[PDB]
mmCIF file of all heavy atoms in Angstrom:
data_model
loop_
_atom_site.group_PDB
_atom_site.id
_atom_site.type_symbol
_atom_site.label_atom_id
_atom_site.label_comp_id
_atom_site.label_asym_id
_atom_site.label_seq_id
_atom_site.Cartn_x
_atom_site.Cartn_y
_atom_site.Cartn_z
ATOM 1 N N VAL A 1 0.835 -1.195 0.000
ATOM 2 C CA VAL A 1 0.000 0.000 0.000
ATOM 3 C C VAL A 1 0.876 1.255 0.000
ATOM 4 O O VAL A 1 0.526 2.240 -0.643
ATOM 5 C CB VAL A 1 -0.992 -0.010 1.181
ATOM 6 C CG1 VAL A 1 -1.819 1.266 1.252
ATOM 7 C CG2 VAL A 1 -1.907 -1.225 1.117
ATOM 8 N N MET A 2 1.996 1.241 0.736
ATOM 9 C CA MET A 2 2.987 2.303 0.615
ATOM 10 C C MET A 2 4.361 1.782 1.017
ATOM 11 O O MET A 2 4.465 0.883 1.847
ATOM 12 C CB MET A 2 2.662 3.503 1.506
ATOM 13 C CG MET A 2 2.187 3.125 2.891
ATOM 14 S SD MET A 2 2.439 4.469 4.078
ATOM 15 C CE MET A 2 1.404 5.748 3.365
ATOM 16 N N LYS A 3 5.399 2.368 0.406
ATOM 17 C CA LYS A 3 6.776 2.181 0.835
ATOM 18 C C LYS A 3 7.079 3.289 1.840
ATOM 19 O O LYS A 3 6.559 4.395 1.711
ATOM 20 C CB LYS A 3 7.762 2.215 -0.341
ATOM 21 C CG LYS A 3 7.517 1.221 -1.477
ATOM 22 C CD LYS A 3 6.509 1.703 -2.519
ATOM 23 C CE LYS A 3 6.543 0.938 -3.828
ATOM 24 N NZ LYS A 3 5.917 -0.402 -3.714
ATOM 25 N N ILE A 4 7.912 2.984 2.841
ATOM 26 C CA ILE A 4 8.087 3.869 3.983
ATOM 27 C C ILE A 4 9.576 4.137 4.204
ATOM 28 O O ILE A 4 10.354 3.208 4.404
ATOM 29 C CB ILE A 4 7.392 3.270 5.224
ATOM 30 C CG1 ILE A 4 5.946 2.873 4.899
ATOM 31 C CG2 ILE A 4 7.476 4.226 6.406
ATOM 32 C CD1 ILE A 4 5.164 2.320 6.061
ATOM 33 N N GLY A 5 9.957 5.421 4.160
ATOM 34 C CA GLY A 5 11.345 5.829 4.316
ATOM 35 C C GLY A 5 11.848 5.625 5.746
ATOM 36 O O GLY A 5 11.058 5.609 6.689
ATOM 37 N N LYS A 6 13.172 5.466 5.886
ATOM 38 C CA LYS A 6 13.809 5.245 7.177
ATOM 39 C C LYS A 6 13.746 6.517 8.023
ATOM 40 O O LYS A 6 13.752 6.449 9.254
ATOM 41 C CB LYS A 6 15.261 4.775 7.010
ATOM 42 C CG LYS A 6 16.178 5.692 6.201
ATOM 43 C CD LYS A 6 17.477 5.032 5.750
ATOM 44 C CE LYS A 6 17.313 3.708 5.021
ATOM 45 N NZ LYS A 6 16.353 3.776 3.891
ATOM 46 N N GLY A 7 13.662 7.675 7.354
ATOM 47 C CA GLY A 7 13.547 8.959 8.027
ATOM 48 C C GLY A 7 12.262 9.099 8.849
ATOM 49 O O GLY A 7 12.138 10.036 9.635
ATOM 50 N N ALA A 8 11.311 8.175 8.666
ATOM 51 C CA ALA A 8 10.084 8.170 9.444
ATOM 52 C C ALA A 8 10.277 7.419 10.762
ATOM 53 O O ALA A 8 9.356 7.359 11.573
ATOM 54 C CB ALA A 8 8.972 7.560 8.627
ATOM 55 N N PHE A 9 11.470 6.847 10.969
ATOM 56 C CA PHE A 9 11.757 6.078 12.169
ATOM 57 C C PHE A 9 12.899 6.714 12.954
ATOM 58 O O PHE A 9 13.867 7.188 12.362
ATOM 59 C CB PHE A 9 12.200 4.656 11.822
ATOM 60 C CG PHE A 9 11.142 3.731 11.273
ATOM 61 C CD1 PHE A 9 10.573 3.955 10.028
ATOM 62 C CD2 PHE A 9 10.745 2.607 11.983
ATOM 63 C CE1 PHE A 9 9.615 3.087 9.523
ATOM 64 C CE2 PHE A 9 9.791 1.737 11.473
ATOM 65 C CZ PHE A 9 9.228 1.981 10.244
ATOM 66 N N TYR A 10 12.794 6.685 14.289
ATOM 67 C CA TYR A 10 13.944 6.932 15.148
ATOM 68 C C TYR A 10 14.170 5.720 16.055
ATOM 69 O O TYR A 10 13.233 5.245 16.688
ATOM 70 C CB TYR A 10 13.767 8.188 16.005
ATOM 71 C CG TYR A 10 14.957 8.466 16.890
ATOM 72 C CD1 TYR A 10 16.143 8.950 16.357
ATOM 73 C CD2 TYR A 10 14.924 8.183 18.250
ATOM 74 C CE1 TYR A 10 17.253 9.185 17.156
ATOM 75 C CE2 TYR A 10 16.023 8.412 19.064
ATOM 76 C CZ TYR A 10 17.192 8.916 18.516
ATOM 77 O OH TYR A 10 18.284 9.143 19.319
ATOM 78 N N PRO A 11 15.400 5.161 16.138
ATOM 79 C CA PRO A 11 16.505 5.547 15.257
ATOM 80 C C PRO A 11 16.273 5.108 13.809
ATOM 81 O O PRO A 11 15.263 4.479 13.486
ATOM 82 C CB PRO A 11 17.731 4.858 15.885
ATOM 83 C CG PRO A 11 17.158 3.679 16.647
ATOM 84 C CD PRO A 11 15.796 4.139 17.123
ATOM 85 N N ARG A 12 17.229 5.468 12.941
ATOM 86 C CA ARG A 12 17.093 5.301 11.500
ATOM 87 C C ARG A 12 17.336 3.823 11.166
ATOM 88 O O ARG A 12 18.414 3.308 11.467
ATOM 89 C CB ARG A 12 18.110 6.239 10.799
ATOM 90 C CG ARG A 12 17.570 6.994 9.545
ATOM 91 C CD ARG A 12 18.733 7.575 8.731
ATOM 92 N NE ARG A 12 18.354 8.696 7.855
ATOM 93 C CZ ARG A 12 18.040 9.919 8.291
ATOM 94 N NH1 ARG A 12 17.902 10.159 9.598
ATOM 95 N NH2 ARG A 12 17.831 10.897 7.415
ATOM 96 N N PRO A 13 16.354 3.075 10.593
ATOM 97 C CA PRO A 13 16.624 1.740 10.054
ATOM 98 C C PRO A 13 17.433 1.814 8.756
ATOM 99 O O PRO A 13 17.358 2.793 8.008
ATOM 100 C CB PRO A 13 15.227 1.138 9.833
ATOM 101 C CG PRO A 13 14.334 2.336 9.624
ATOM 102 C CD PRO A 13 14.931 3.430 10.488
ATOM 103 N N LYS A 14 18.202 0.750 8.511
ATOM 104 C CA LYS A 14 19.165 0.694 7.421
ATOM 105 C C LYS A 14 18.410 0.661 6.097
ATOM 106 O O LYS A 14 18.914 1.128 5.076
ATOM 107 C CB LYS A 14 20.050 -0.559 7.512
ATOM 108 C CG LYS A 14 20.071 -1.284 8.856
ATOM 109 C CD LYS A 14 18.913 -2.261 9.039
ATOM 110 C CE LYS A 14 18.449 -2.385 10.476
ATOM 111 N NZ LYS A 14 19.545 -2.801 11.395
ATOM 112 N N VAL A 15 17.198 0.092 6.165
ATOM 113 C CA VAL A 15 16.394 -0.276 5.011
ATOM 114 C C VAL A 15 14.981 0.284 5.203
ATOM 115 O O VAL A 15 14.475 0.359 6.325
ATOM 116 C CB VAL A 15 16.396 -1.810 4.849
ATOM 117 C CG1 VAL A 15 17.807 -2.380 4.954
ATOM 118 C CG2 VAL A 15 15.485 -2.505 5.856
ATOM 119 N N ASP A 16 14.340 0.674 4.095
ATOM 120 C CA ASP A 16 12.972 1.166 4.140
ATOM 121 C C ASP A 16 12.035 0.056 4.622
ATOM 122 O O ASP A 16 12.395 -1.122 4.609
ATOM 123 C CB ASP A 16 12.522 1.692 2.770
ATOM 124 C CG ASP A 16 13.071 3.058 2.375
ATOM 125 O OD1 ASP A 16 13.901 3.611 3.126
ATOM 126 O OD2 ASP A 16 12.657 3.562 1.308
ATOM 127 N N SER A 17 10.829 0.464 5.052
ATOM 128 C CA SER A 17 9.716 -0.437 5.333
ATOM 129 C C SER A 17 8.678 -0.355 4.207
ATOM 130 O O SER A 17 8.829 0.429 3.271
ATOM 131 C CB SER A 17 9.094 -0.127 6.687
ATOM 132 O OG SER A 17 9.731 -0.850 7.734
ATOM 133 N N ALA A 18 7.611 -1.163 4.316
ATOM 134 C CA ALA A 18 6.547 -1.180 3.324
ATOM 135 C C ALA A 18 5.278 -1.761 3.937
ATOM 136 O O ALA A 18 5.340 -2.802 4.584
ATOM 137 C CB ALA A 18 6.982 -1.995 2.136
ATOM 138 N N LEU A 19 4.136 -1.105 3.696
ATOM 139 C CA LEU A 19 2.879 -1.463 4.336
ATOM 140 C C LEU A 19 2.108 -2.412 3.427
ATOM 141 O O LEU A 19 1.790 -2.056 2.299
ATOM 142 C CB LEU A 19 2.063 -0.193 4.607
ATOM 143 C CG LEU A 19 0.787 -0.410 5.428
ATOM 144 C CD1 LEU A 19 1.129 -0.620 6.896
ATOM 145 C CD2 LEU A 19 -0.189 0.749 5.270
ATOM 146 N N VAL A 20 1.769 -3.596 3.948
ATOM 147 C CA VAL A 20 1.377 -4.726 3.120
ATOM 148 C C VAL A 20 -0.011 -5.200 3.523
ATOM 149 O O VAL A 20 -0.153 -5.891 4.527
ATOM 150 C CB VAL A 20 2.406 -5.866 3.257
ATOM 151 C CG1 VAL A 20 1.811 -7.231 2.950
ATOM 152 C CG2 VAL A 20 3.635 -5.607 2.403
ATOM 153 N N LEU A 21 -1.016 -4.866 2.708
ATOM 154 C CA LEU A 21 -2.363 -5.378 2.910
ATOM 155 C C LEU A 21 -2.435 -6.838 2.475
ATOM 156 O O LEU A 21 -1.883 -7.188 1.437
ATOM 157 C CB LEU A 21 -3.361 -4.538 2.107
ATOM 158 C CG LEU A 21 -4.731 -5.177 1.878
ATOM 159 C CD1 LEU A 21 -5.448 -5.461 3.190
ATOM 160 C CD2 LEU A 21 -5.595 -4.294 0.992
ATOM 161 N N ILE A 22 -3.132 -7.652 3.284
ATOM 162 C CA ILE A 22 -3.463 -9.033 2.967
ATOM 163 C C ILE A 22 -4.971 -9.219 3.094
ATOM 164 O O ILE A 22 -5.470 -9.420 4.200
ATOM 165 C CB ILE A 22 -2.748 -10.032 3.901
ATOM 166 C CG1 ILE A 22 -1.228 -9.921 3.832
ATOM 167 C CG2 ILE A 22 -3.213 -11.457 3.620
ATOM 168 C CD1 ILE A 22 -0.529 -10.937 4.721
ATOM 169 N N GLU A 23 -5.673 -9.190 1.955
ATOM 170 C CA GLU A 23 -7.078 -9.557 1.903
ATOM 171 C C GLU A 23 -7.146 -11.048 1.598
ATOM 172 O O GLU A 23 -6.662 -11.476 0.553
ATOM 173 C CB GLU A 23 -7.814 -8.762 0.823
ATOM 174 C CG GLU A 23 -7.532 -7.270 0.819
ATOM 175 C CD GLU A 23 -8.285 -6.506 -0.260
ATOM 176 O OE1 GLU A 23 -9.526 -6.371 -0.138
ATOM 177 O OE2 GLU A 23 -7.630 -6.051 -1.227
ATOM 178 N N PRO A 24 -7.671 -11.901 2.502
ATOM 179 C CA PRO A 24 -7.832 -13.329 2.218
ATOM 180 C C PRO A 24 -8.872 -13.645 1.145
ATOM 181 O O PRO A 24 -9.852 -12.922 0.994
ATOM 182 C CB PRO A 24 -8.280 -13.928 3.558
ATOM 183 C CG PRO A 24 -7.847 -12.906 4.581
ATOM 184 C CD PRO A 24 -8.037 -11.575 3.883
ATOM 185 N N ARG A 25 -8.641 -14.749 0.424
ATOM 186 C CA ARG A 25 -9.554 -15.242 -0.595
ATOM 187 C C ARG A 25 -10.769 -15.847 0.102
ATOM 188 O O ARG A 25 -10.689 -16.219 1.271
ATOM 189 C CB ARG A 25 -8.852 -16.290 -1.474
ATOM 190 C CG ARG A 25 -7.580 -15.794 -2.151
ATOM 191 C CD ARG A 25 -6.649 -16.866 -2.694
ATOM 192 N NE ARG A 25 -6.878 -17.131 -4.107
ATOM 193 C CZ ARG A 25 -6.007 -17.710 -4.931
ATOM 194 N NH1 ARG A 25 -4.844 -18.146 -4.477
ATOM 195 N NH2 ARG A 25 -6.292 -17.841 -6.215
ATOM 196 N N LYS A 26 -11.892 -15.948 -0.621
ATOM 197 C CA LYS A 26 -13.023 -16.735 -0.153
ATOM 198 C C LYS A 26 -13.069 -18.071 -0.887
ATOM 199 O O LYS A 26 -14.102 -18.725 -0.978
ATOM 200 C CB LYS A 26 -14.320 -15.920 -0.210
ATOM 201 C CG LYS A 26 -15.538 -16.557 0.454
ATOM 202 C CD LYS A 26 -15.246 -17.427 1.681
ATOM 203 C CE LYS A 26 -14.473 -16.735 2.788
ATOM 204 N NZ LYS A 26 -15.122 -15.468 3.204
ATOM 205 N N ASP A 27 -11.904 -18.461 -1.403
ATOM 206 C CA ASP A 27 -11.672 -19.785 -1.941
ATOM 207 C C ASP A 27 -10.159 -19.976 -1.926
ATOM 208 O O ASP A 27 -9.487 -19.875 -2.952
ATOM 209 C CB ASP A 27 -12.337 -19.876 -3.314
ATOM 210 C CG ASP A 27 -12.215 -18.589 -4.112
ATOM 211 O OD1 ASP A 27 -11.409 -17.713 -3.703
ATOM 212 O OD2 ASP A 27 -12.946 -18.458 -5.119
ATOM 213 N N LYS A 28 -9.649 -20.174 -0.706
ATOM 214 C CA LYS A 28 -8.228 -20.303 -0.455
ATOM 215 C C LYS A 28 -7.783 -21.618 -1.075
ATOM 216 O O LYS A 28 -8.465 -22.626 -0.927
ATOM 217 C CB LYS A 28 -7.900 -20.329 1.044
ATOM 218 C CG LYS A 28 -8.638 -19.329 1.931
ATOM 219 C CD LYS A 28 -9.858 -19.913 2.645
ATOM 220 C CE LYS A 28 -10.489 -18.955 3.635
ATOM 221 N NZ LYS A 28 -9.514 -18.546 4.679
#
């Protein structure tokens, strides 16, 4: 849903984060 910069965290992570929606199937 979005990629997230390290500047949004204290302390600074080495690598960006990313917000990941998981909508389950109704026929898994």
Side-chain angles (χ1 to χ4, degrees):
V1 177
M2 42 157 62
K3 304 84 163 75
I4 309 182
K6 57 195 52 52
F9 289 67
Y10 181 73
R12 222 195 202 72
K14 343 84 212 303
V15 313
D16 284 5
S17 271
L19 187 76
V20 155
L21 163 61
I22 300 182
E23 313 180 70
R25 303 163 95 160
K26 189 33 56 53
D27 38 13
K28 317 98 174 301

